[PDB]
C-alpha cells in the first residue's frame, strides 16, 4: 500500500515539473509576443 | 519579461513549488510509515515465533 502511494506520489512530482514546463513555454510565447509588438510598433 | 507576465510566472510557480513541497513531505511521511510498518512486522514475528517454538 504505502510502495503504491508512494509512486503515486512521484507521478504527481512529475505531472508538477510538466506544468512548470508547460508555464514556462507559454510565458516565452507571451514574452515573445511582447517583444515583437515593440519591434513592429 | 513584462510585468503582466512576471505575475502570471511568480503565481504559478509559487503555487507549483507548493504543491512539490506538499508532495515531497507526503513522501517522507510514507517513508516514515514504512518504517513504523517495519518494526510493527519485527514485533509481530517475534511474537508469532515465540508462540510457535
Ligand atoms: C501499523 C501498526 O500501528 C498500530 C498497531 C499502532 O500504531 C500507532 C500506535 C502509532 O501512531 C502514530 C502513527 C505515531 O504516534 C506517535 C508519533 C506518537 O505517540 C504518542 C502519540
Ligand atoms: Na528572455
Avoid: M, R, V
Avoid at 507521478?11 to 517583444?35: P, R, T, V, Y
Amino acid at each position: 500500500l504505502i510502495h503504491s502511494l508512494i509512486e503515486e506520489s512521484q507521478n504527481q512530482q512529475e505531472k508538477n515539473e510538466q506544468e512548470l514546463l508547460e508555464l514556462d513555454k507559454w510565458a516565452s510565447l507571451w514574452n515573445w509576443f511582447n517583444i515583437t509588438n515593440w519591434l513592429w510598433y
